[model samples]
Target: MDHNTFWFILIAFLFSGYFLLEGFDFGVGILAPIIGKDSAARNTVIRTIGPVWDGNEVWLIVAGGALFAAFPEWYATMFSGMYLPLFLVLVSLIIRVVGLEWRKKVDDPRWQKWSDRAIFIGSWTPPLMWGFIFANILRGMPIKADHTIDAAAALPGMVNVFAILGALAFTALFALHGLAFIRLKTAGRVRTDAAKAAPGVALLAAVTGGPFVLWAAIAYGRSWSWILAVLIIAAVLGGAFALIKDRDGLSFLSTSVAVIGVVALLFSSLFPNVMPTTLADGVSLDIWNASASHYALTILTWTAAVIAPLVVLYQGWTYWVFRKRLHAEP
Candidate 1:
């Protein structure tokens, strides 16, 4: 394949990896209060993600680095235009991580309460904001011919419909995935709660996700729309089946696949064009038009190739070492 195709695929792989890994992390964070009813239960939830949450988040960092190196123009437009939302995402992530690390240092109820709220807020914001971001991507944004966003028209209008739907869909899907994680990580009350909650969340995902996918297909036309639609249906079915069979691991795995599929669908549909321009009729910032120099991508490509696997391996080792179900206290 050509260089552009290769780079696009590499970027897509990185994006998909980030969504699949971090999506569950966000889901599980949100699920903590729900599944971990008491201190012990919450501890169990915390333990499950303790070793990997920080590492998993690196996927996003890497994805951003890759975008910066591989597609500077797209980066410039998106970062400039979507400044507020991106800032929120970064702040929320910081709060979530700090809260997770600090919660363990104290045993006070007040501290735990604050941390819990932070986790919930952090977990919820990214998915909701990302949905809006992607929706805007698919629906197009107001950009000048110079590939800059139109700051004047930055309100929530029809231009943002798809983005809203995207946010809601991700929120539901991430929550569903988290419920599945809780089911796998703990037993007794936590597991039972997760099992009960999983089905309903899965159903809600189907209800919202079906229409969202359809809308995406209608908006984007024939490219990867059908494929994404099929994948969504498959995810819904697979998640339902896993729940019915009482297979927590399988349910989580299926949910992960569903998340990956959605990311892939979006990538495929928006291939070539890193950012679509809505303001100036018929203007688009595609991969070829927006990419960085060949040398920069090559350097990044090598670094990511080495670092990405190490990150994954380290995460796997952590989970393996801490495989046992957590108890109420240390």
Candidate 2:
């Protein structure tokens, strides 16, 4: 394949990797409040992810680095235009990471409670906002005459209804996924809570996200609409089946697949166009046109091929080492 094609595929894989890895991290964080019945329980939940949470975030960093290196123009346009929203995402990530680490350092119950709440908010907000951001990227946004997205342009008001729906869907889905993860890792009250919460969260995602996908398909005249539609249906069905069977691992796996399906569907719908401009009326930053030179892509692709697998192996080993469910500390 051509260098552009290779780089695009690599970047797409990185994006999927981020979703699969950090998706669960976000899931665990969001569900910590519901899954943990006490401070000890909360600590256990946090401990379940402590070793791997920071590592999972690496996928995002890799994806962003790839995007900037391979398609600087598109990156420039997007980061500049969506600066405020993206800034919120950065802050949320920082707060979430800090809260997770710092929560353990404090011994006081009141301090722990505050940290718990902070973790909860920080965990929940990013996924919701990221979904909105991706949805807008897919749905297209205003671009100026100079091909730059003015950061001050209309703020949140410019993001359409579909973007908001996307955010809500992401939030609910991540929370549901989080619960499933908790259920898989722990038993008793935490597992029961996760089981109960899973079905409801799954249903809500279906109700909210299903319609939005359909609307986007019709609105944008997307070719893979039917395929995405089917995936959504399958995600709901798969989650329902897992919940009925009390299969926590399977349930979490299903939710993860659903997340991937939705993301793939969205990406497929917007392929070739790294960013679509609504203001200019159907203008797109095509992948080939926006990509870096062949030499850059060639070198990057080789490095990524080796590095990505090592990263995955390390992550897998981390999980394997920490395999047992966390119990309440003495």
Candidate 3:
């Protein structure tokens, strides 16, 4: 593949990693209140993610960094166009970080209580906003021929049918993903509750996700995207089935696969074009127009080649060390 295509795929990989890993982080945070009947239970639920949740967020940071370096035009234009939603995502992430890190710093029940609430708010909002952001971007932006955004036009008409569905789909899918993670990482009542709740959440994900994927396919999806969309739903359904059978590992694997498929379908549909424009005069930002110089990409490619593997291995080790399930103490 060419440099631009390579970078596009790399960026997609980064995002896929982000959603797959942090997706569960979000799920666990949201699930804390639902399955955690009391303080101890909630603490156990929260403990499952305590070690790696912040690290998972680094995928997003890396993705953004890659976007800035490799696809500066797409990066700048998208930032300008999606300013408010981006702002909200950042704010929500900050709140989440604070909640996750500070919740255990003090031993006070009230302190933990408010922090847990923050975790839930912080966990749920970003996925919902991200869904809207991606959906609206896919729908199209009002960019002038000169590559500047027509911000007023873009913002006013940002909310469309797909946007709403996208928001719901992401939130529901993440919740399902979280339940599966809970089942994987905890034992006893917490695990049982998560296993029981997972099938329902997976069904909810299917309900919300199917419509959005179908809509996307009808609109901008190619043959490959259609296939991916089908497989994505199938994976979710398979995960639900696994949950029903109390197969925790398979359920988590299926949800992770579904997350990967969603990211793949999105990037594949947007293969050449990083940002599609609405107006006749406006040119959509493709890999060619949006990309940085060849030299920059070549340097980045080599750097990533060296650094990425080490990062992955280190993170893998972290997970391996913490792989044992946390048993709830009565």
Every model: Cα RMSD to truth:
2.0, 2.0, 1.0
Q: TM-score for all predictions? A: 0.93, 0.93, 0.98
lDDT measured at residue 315 in model 2 versus the true structure, 0 to 100: 78
Please write out the lDDT profile of model 3 over residues 104-197, one tens digit for every residue. 8999989998898789889989889888888877777887798778666777778777888998898888888888899889998889878666
Model 2 lDDT on a 0 to 1 scale: 0.76
RMSD of 3: 1.0
Q: Give the top-scoring candidate (TM-score).
A: 3
lDDT of 2 by residue, 119-192 (tens): 88778888888888888888887775555776676466547788999888777767666766777777555566
lDDT of 1: 0.78
Order the candidates by lDDT, highest first — what do you get?
3, 1, 2
lDDT of 2 at 239: 66
